[PDB]
Design a protein around this nucleic acid. Structure first.
Ligand SMILES: [Mg+2]
Ligand SMILES: [Mg+2]
Ligand SMILES: [Mg+2]
Ligand SMILES: [Mg+2]
Ligand SMILES: [Mg+2]
Ligand SMILES: [Mg+2]
Ligand SMILES: [Mg+2]
Ligand SMILES: [Mg+2]
Ligand SMILES: [Mg+2]
Ligand SMILES: [Mg+2]
Ligand SMILES: [Mg+2]
Ligand SMILES: [Mg+2]
Ligand SMILES: [Mg+2]
Ligand SMILES: [Mg+2]
Ligand SMILES: [Mg+2]
Ligand SMILES: [Mg+2]
Ligand SMILES: [Mg+2]
Ligand SMILES: [Mg+2]
Ligand SMILES: [Mg+2]
Ligand SMILES: [Mg+2]
Ligand SMILES: [Mg+2]
Ligand SMILES: [Mg+2]
Ligand SMILES: [Mg+2]
Lengths: 119, 102, 48, 210, 58
RNA sequence: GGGCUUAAGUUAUCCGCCGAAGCUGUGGCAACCUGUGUGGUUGGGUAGGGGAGCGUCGUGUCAGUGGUGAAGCUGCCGGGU
């Protein structure tokens, strides 16, 4: 029972060439070269799906820092004040408030100022 | 009028009529759930303390179960022959916010 | 009234043949022999 | 279970009666055992005349194609090496026999279970004979259609001179005709019903009985 | 008997096998895991053996 | 590295925060143990051991299907760990 490889073989090649359908040069034309980049692409995507948490937290923290420093309060004192006041609104909602509802963010800044240890 | 609410260890800025992508919950479609609120803003009026947030109820209804994007994991390390393929969908649940009653 | 299409072997009676050197998801590449040496290519006699 | 039961000889309308011995026609239907016996049967049926030429049997290829070193080509030893186009096949098929030495007790029991399943399902009929005088296929087609359906087995045993029944049922293409000394599990399982001639059933019982 | 409260604050990686087995015997399995043990000298000994990896209370 | 002594240097001390795939929260999958209502523990991995599968070709049987268009090839829209 001789078996010809082509019908079964082309499936993974079509899959990989589809996955590599925006790459430059040989990486989008040649299966072997596309295969190497798809390994790197998968590794990068896995790494970046976990680094995305930190990237977005850093962005939120920077925006909160800017918005609170506009009110004469540093980010660390602002966060400690919120923690002491017991308001568990997170970095994300706080950044969205800073960009969108600056008055609500400033009210939270006042809450943190009042909840400061003052020591 | 809008509320910073929490659901399933993740927070949302919701308003009446909004559609929110909630972590999957057991309640069946068309039923109603209460989202725990962490902040309420009614315009130059910000309710933040626990005692007052206890009295406010954010009520919403379940619309259906939706799936996230298909994620393809290929764990790989060079010069060892090691590969591991995997997939993921991460089902969630639609929610429509019906009211923020103080 | 069995009919030929209802004849199946007992579970565990027909173990699948392990096919070696068919990719790194199974006994691929070195085919369960390791790297280099006599055992990489032939065998060692039992009297040796 | 070893109950002996009674079926009625027909000859179209009605005749005397015949006994199914029970010890055969009423035993357990070990499906794995029947499967193994049938698989061994088909393996024995295999012919297995398949062959390929190895690198030693492919024509030519005696000399080294070129020098070992200095050419910039890969080291080759023969033009008929397996990796070459037109070279020998490494582990291709060779002629062999697929027959399996299934034990006698296993083969016989499988046959008993296969017969017993449709004995309990009432798919064995016994006729005195099909066709009278000279032999047509129209007559027996009728006798059998009167019996039931058209995925049939016929037993006539009489290995030398039962030409009437044999040649009558030979050309149906939904009938398999056998001598009682060749029942075999594969054919019994493939049959949806068996019709024995009176002599066929008698000879099978005489050949094997407790 | 004062019901010692022991929690793991450092990982067992690169620690001595003695220390890792002491953590296992105490029942601590992760960083931040807490167990309650009696004020028995054997448990005081385990705590002092892995004193750089755990904290103890009453 | 920019720059820094008007410390952004050293040191003692106090108050905060940042910070990992660690921990916790939430949702899904899996292996094992356990009395079997619960729950517990676990799931980086080369050589390598064990287990369970996908796809190709041939073939017994049954059910079929095909010029109202099979195979192959090639789009789109989807699905599964
Ligand atoms: Mg900054
Ligand atoms: Mg290496
Ligand atoms: Mg390998
Ligand atoms: Mg390789
Ligand atoms: Mg080995
Ligand atoms: Mg080797
Ligand atoms: Mg090698
Ligand atoms: Mg070596
Ligand atoms: Mg070796
Ligand atoms: Mg040895
Ligand atoms: Mg020898
Ligand atoms: Mg030669
Ligand atoms: Mg060259
Ligand atoms: Mg040579
Ligand atoms: Mg040839
Ligand atoms: Mg993290
Ligand atoms: Mg973890
Ligand atoms: Mg967790
Ligand atoms: Mg593993
Ligand atoms: Mg792990
Ligand atoms: Mg291995
Ligand atoms: Mg048709
Ligand atoms: Mg074909």
């Amino acid at each position: 029972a001789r078996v010809k490889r082509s019908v079964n073989a082309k499936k993974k090649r079509r899959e990989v060439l589809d996955q590599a359908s925006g790459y430059r040069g040989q990486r989008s034309r040649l299966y072997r070269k596309a295969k190497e980049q798809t390994l790197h692409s998968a590794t990068y995507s896995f790494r970046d799906r976990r680094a995305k948490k930190g990237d977005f937290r850093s962005l939120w923290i920077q925006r909160i820092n800017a918005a609170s420093r506009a009110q004469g309060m540093t980010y660390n004192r602002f966060i400690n004040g919120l923690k002491n006041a017991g308001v568990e609104v997170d970095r994300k909602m706080l950044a969205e408030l800073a960009v969108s509802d600056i008055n609500a963010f400033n009210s939270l800044v006042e809450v943190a100022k009042a909840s400061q240890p003052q020591n | 009028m809008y509320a910073i609410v929490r659901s399933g260890g993740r927070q949302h800025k919701v308003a009446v009529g909004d559609v929110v992508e909630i972590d999957k919950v057991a309640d069946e479609a068309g039923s109603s759930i209460e989202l725990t609120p962490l902040l309420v803003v009614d315009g130059e009026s910000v309710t933040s303390d626990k005692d007052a947030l206890g009295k406010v109820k954010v009520t919403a209804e379940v619309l259906g179960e939706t799936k996230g994007p298909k994620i393809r994991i290929l764990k790989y390390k060079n010069k060892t022959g090691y590969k591991k393929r995997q997939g993921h969908r991460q089902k969630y649940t639609q929610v429509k916010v019906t009211g923020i009653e103080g | 009234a069995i009919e030929l299409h209802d004849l199946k072997p007992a579970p565990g009676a027909h173990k699948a043949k392990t096919r070696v050197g068919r990719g790194e998801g199974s006994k691929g590449k070195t085919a369960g022999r390791g790297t280099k040496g006599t055992g990489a290519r032939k065998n060692v006699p039992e009297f040796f | 279970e070893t109950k002996t039961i009674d079926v009625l000889d027909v000859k179209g309308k009605k005749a005397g009666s015949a006994e199914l011995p029970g010890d055969l026609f009423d035993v357990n239907t070990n499906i794995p055992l029947i499967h193994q016996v049938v698989v061994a049967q088909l393996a024995a049926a295999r012919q297995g005349t398949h062959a390929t030429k190895t690198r030693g049997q492919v024509s030519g290829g005696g000399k080294k194609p070129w020098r070992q070193k200095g050419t910039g080509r890969a080291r080759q030893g023969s033009t008929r090496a397996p990796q070459w186009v037109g070279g020998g096949t490494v582990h291709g098929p060779q002629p062999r026999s697929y027959a399996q030495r299934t034990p006698k007790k296993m083969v016989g029991a499988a046959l008993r279970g296969a017969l017993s399943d449709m004995a309990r399902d009432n798919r064995i009929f016994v006729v005195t004979s099909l066709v009278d005088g000279d032999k047509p296929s129209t007559k027996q087609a009728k006798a059998v259609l009167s019996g039931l359906a058209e995925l049939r087995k016929v037993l006539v045993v009489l290995d030398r001179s039962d030409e009437i029944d044999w040649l009558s049922v030979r050309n149906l293409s939904e009938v398999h005709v056998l001598a009682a000394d060749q029942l075999n599990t594969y054919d019994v399982v493939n049959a949806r019903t068996i019709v024995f001639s009176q002599a066929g059933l008698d000879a099978f019982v005489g050949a094997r009985s407790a | 008997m004062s019901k010692l409260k022991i929690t793991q604050i450092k990982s067992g990686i690169a620690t001595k096998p003695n220390h890792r087995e002491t953590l296992r015997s105490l029942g601590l399995k992760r960083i931040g895991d807490t167990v309650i043990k009696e004020d028995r000298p054997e448990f005081r000994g385990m705590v002092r053996t892995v004193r750089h990896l755990v904290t103890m209370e009453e």
